[PDB]
Design an enzyme around this catalytic site. Structure first.
Site, PDB file in Angstrom:
ATOM      1  CG  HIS A  16       5.850  -6.310 -14.460  1.00  0.00           C
ATOM      2  ND1 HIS A  16       7.012  -6.772 -15.042  1.00  0.00           N
ATOM      3  CD2 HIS A  16       6.221  -5.708 -13.304  1.00  0.00           C
ATOM      4  CE1 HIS A  16       8.038  -6.472 -14.267  1.00  0.00           C
ATOM      5  NE2 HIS A  16       7.588  -5.825 -13.208  1.00  0.00           N
ATOM      6  CG  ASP A  24      -6.267  14.152  -0.530  1.00  0.00           C
ATOM      7  OD1 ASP A  24      -6.675  14.730  -1.559  1.00  0.00           O
ATOM      8  OD2 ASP A  24      -5.231  14.503   0.073  1.00  0.00           O
TER       9      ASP A  24
HETATM   10  O1  LIG Z   1      -5.742  17.340  -1.623  1.00  0.00           O
HETATM   11  C1  LIG Z   1      -4.634  17.355  -2.503  1.00  0.00           C
HETATM   12  C2  LIG Z   1      -3.338  17.133  -1.730  1.00  0.00           C
HETATM   13  O2  LIG Z   1      -3.460  16.008  -0.901  1.00  0.00           O
HETATM   14  C3  LIG Z   1      -2.972  18.325  -0.855  1.00  0.00           C
HETATM   15  O3  LIG Z   1      -3.777  18.296   0.302  1.00  0.00           O
HETATM   16  C4  LIG Z   1      -3.111  19.668  -1.586  1.00  0.00           C
HETATM   17  O4  LIG Z   1      -4.303  19.767  -2.359  1.00  0.00           O
HETATM   18  C5  LIG Z   1      -4.592  18.692  -3.253  1.00  0.00           C
HETATM   19  O5  LIG Z   1      -3.674  18.628  -4.334  1.00  0.00           O
END
Ligand SMILES: O[C@@H]1[C@H](O)[C@H](O)CO[C@H]1O
Ligand SMILES: O[C@@H]1[C@H](O)[C@H](O)CO[C@H]1O
Lengths: 129, 130
Positions: A16, A24
């Site tokens: 919790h 990404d």
């Molecule tokens: O890839 C990451 C985010 O997703 C955005 O694309 C900007 O640059 C980075 O901080």
């Protein structure tokens, strides 16, 4: 069944209020024991596929997303909405805050995917396990 | 260019004769410093995609494959042959020896994929890098 070893480990340490993130390729993930690099090449694996997989292995109460996603990546946001239960709360924060949260005291892991579309980053807050 | 930190770091330590392996989901990879787990779910990432990516970052002189791949996974064998140069030697050894090679003294990394089709394992032997 096939699962990531580092993800299954982290999910087991999660209770919790604990956070697990999926990110990404360009997210500046701090270089420590929480970092889990699954990236192979551009868009492999996709953010959305890793998210779908993690959600099957977790009890989630809140998710956090960059406010910026709404404008800069509506397709991703729509894909996320379609994936999560309609009862879990979606909180939008500044992307700059999403970055701080990579180092949150309750952050139990930072998954890096190969995703290249902007602001494909999420943080998942566990319910009671 | 998107790149795996671990794979990139392993390759930086790779010289002539050193091994790097790419494996399927069920391959018994010893849990040590060489284990690079990229598996997400069934067939993600695929063996052949990870192999394609790694071959761009490496110079290879030989590959090792399980003798068993000929009968049990001929489509994977064909996909591997399409990816590699004609001037690189293919050596077939028993799968048991493929397993042994995960601990080979010159093994610089064992990559695990989500691949489920059987005998989707390879060992890549480096040429001269400098
Ligand atoms: O890839 C990451 C985010 O997703 C955005 O694309 C900007 O640059 C980075 O901080
Ligand atoms: O996954 C590996 C092999 O590829 C074979 O399929 C048998 O099981 C494991 O040793």
């Amino acid at each position: 069944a096939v699962l990531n070893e580092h993800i299954s480990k982290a999910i087991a340490t999660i209770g919790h209020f604990d956070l697990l993130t999926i990110n990404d390729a360009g997210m500046p993930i701090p270089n420590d024991h929480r970092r889990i690099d699954l990236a192979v090449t551009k868009n492999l694996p996709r953010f959305i596929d890793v998210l779908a997989t993690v959600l099957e292995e977790m009890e989630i109460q809140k998710i956090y997303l960059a406010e910026e996603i709404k404008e800069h990546n509506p397709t991703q946001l729509q894909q996320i909405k379609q994936l999560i239960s309609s009862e879990i709360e979606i909180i939008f924060i500044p992307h700059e805050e999403m970055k701080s949260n990579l180092a949150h005291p309750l952050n139990k892991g930072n998954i890096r995917t190969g995703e290249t579309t902007p602001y494909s980053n999420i943080a998942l807050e566990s319910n009671v396990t």
